Amino acid sequence: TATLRPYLSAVRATLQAALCLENFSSQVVERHNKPEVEVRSSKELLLQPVTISRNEKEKVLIEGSINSVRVSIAVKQADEIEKILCHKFMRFMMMRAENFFILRRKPVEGYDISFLITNFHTEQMYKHKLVDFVIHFMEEIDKEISEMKLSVNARARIVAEEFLKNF
Template sequence: IVERHNIPEVEACKMPKVILMTLYITRLPLEYVWIKSSIDSIRPIVKIKHEDDIEHILARGMTRVLNLRFMKYINWEISEMKLSLDTRARIVAESFLGHVV
């Protein structure tokens, strides 16, 4: 069972004790990955350099691919949650109707 929150602790920052170490990885000043983490979520921040038009096009394409992969995973997770909810609702309905009939 996973407890779900509307606002991750990384964004809320209500309890400083649950915010974990921030990791900053850099190759150049224009290229870095910054990972903010807490006990219930992680927020990756990726900066890609755009020095010329080719790099801009390649970075935009890579960002689009990463977004599509993320959305595919989120859509899959939502579908799984809906199936789980339907299954639980069916079990409850059968149990309720079994006692009524």
């Protein structure tokens, strides 16, 4: 309940700060190359978590590292019919996580979706476009739910007419 322009302006700046990444071979297993933010074996390689928030419900969590970033997001869910449609939408977005290369197949606890960005994505993909996908997501998700709430309500009328019309 603040405004949308500064929120995405803060998140966009923190992301550029946290996508300063490089390759890093492991120091606990012989020749592994993992994202240290997920395994969390080496505390020194884990930067601080930082949070951003318009309000209590909406917020973002950037857990950075030397070779990984984790961007958990919480979306606003005013009513129950919006909690449902957001829960399904992420499931159908996680199911195609091999195509969203920066995506986690499950979300962080307390959040609705979570991204994961390794040092191989910045080398291959355009670092500044990945940010624009996270930001484009955060401002379109509210529109793509109400468009479904309106689509459920429109369906419920036809299902009523097609029953009462026959009387």
